[PDB]
Write a protein that binds this ligand. Structure first.
Ligand SMILES: O=P(O)(O)[C@H](S)c1ccc(Cl)cc1Cl
Ligand SMILES: [Zn+2]
Length: 227
């Protein structure tokens, strides 16, 4: 299918968004409503995710987290706002989105000419530090710069699932926005937290991995140019 929504553990689901270059995002089905982690590529892909959500739950979509300011994590924002969901990020992500959205849309369209020229749609709930949702069961945090300066992790403690958006994946990927020397330092700050982790969801490539995806990507980025 163009997009799938599949249970990984309990209320934690993975979105495989096969539009453009495949990106994987998360959905958490909570008591009061639904939290989406990663807005998906465009308002149209966001609508496709919402259609899948409505086959699982009638509860409202409460909020969507932009794990960084890029098009694959924030492009769906216009749709989420339109249905009354909050769009949530760190202040750093929001500020970078304000200044750099035009640049990232242009960069996206260089690789994907078919991708739309999306207007800026900023987060309307901004956090200055780490933050939680769903009565503490969805936990967002910053551990330093990596793939972009601002990317955050989202941890689901009950299910021992870690999502890093674009930070964790199988292939090296684009480093044009990256801090190549800080990247492994951020991954080591992450590992030093000693979070119980059964599953890491990669943000690109095949999503389902164990904790070893962190070490896999760390070894790749240490061999990269500018390391
Ligand atoms: O940098 P990432 O991991 O988001 C990935 S490698 C990426 C790079 C360029 C373009 Cl146009 C699309 C994508 Cl999905
Ligand atoms: Zn990405």
């Amino acid at each position: 299918a163009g997009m799938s929504l599949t249970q990984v553990s309990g209320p934690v689901y993975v979105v495989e968004d096969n539009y453009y270059v495949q990106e994987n995002s998360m959905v958490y089905f909570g008591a009061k409503g639904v939290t989406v982690v990663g807005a998906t590529w465009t308002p149209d892909t966001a609508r496709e995710l919402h259609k899948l959500i409505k086959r699982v739950s009638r509860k409202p979509v409460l909020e969507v987290i932009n794990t960084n300011y890029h098009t694959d994590r924030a492009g769906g924002n216009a749709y989420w706002k339109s249905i009354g969901a909050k769009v949530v990020s760190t202040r750093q992500t929001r500020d970078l989105m304000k200044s750099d959205w035009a640049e990232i849309v242009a960069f996206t369209r260089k690789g994907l000419p078919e991708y739309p020229d999306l207007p800026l749609v900023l987060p309307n709930v901004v956090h200055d530090g780490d933050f939680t949702l769903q009565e503490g069961k969805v936990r967002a945090f910053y551990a330093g710069p990596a793939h972009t300066p601002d990317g955050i992790f989202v941890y689901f403690p009950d299910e021992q699932v870690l999502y890093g958006g674009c930070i964790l994946k199988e292939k090296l990927g684009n480093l044009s926005f990256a801090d190549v020397k800080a990247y492994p330092q951020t991954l080591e700050r992450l590992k030093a937290m000693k979070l119980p982790i059964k599953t890491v969801i990669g943000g690109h490539d095949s999503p389902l991995h164990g904790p070893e995806l962190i070490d896999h990507y760390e070894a790749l980025i240490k061999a990269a140019p500018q390391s």
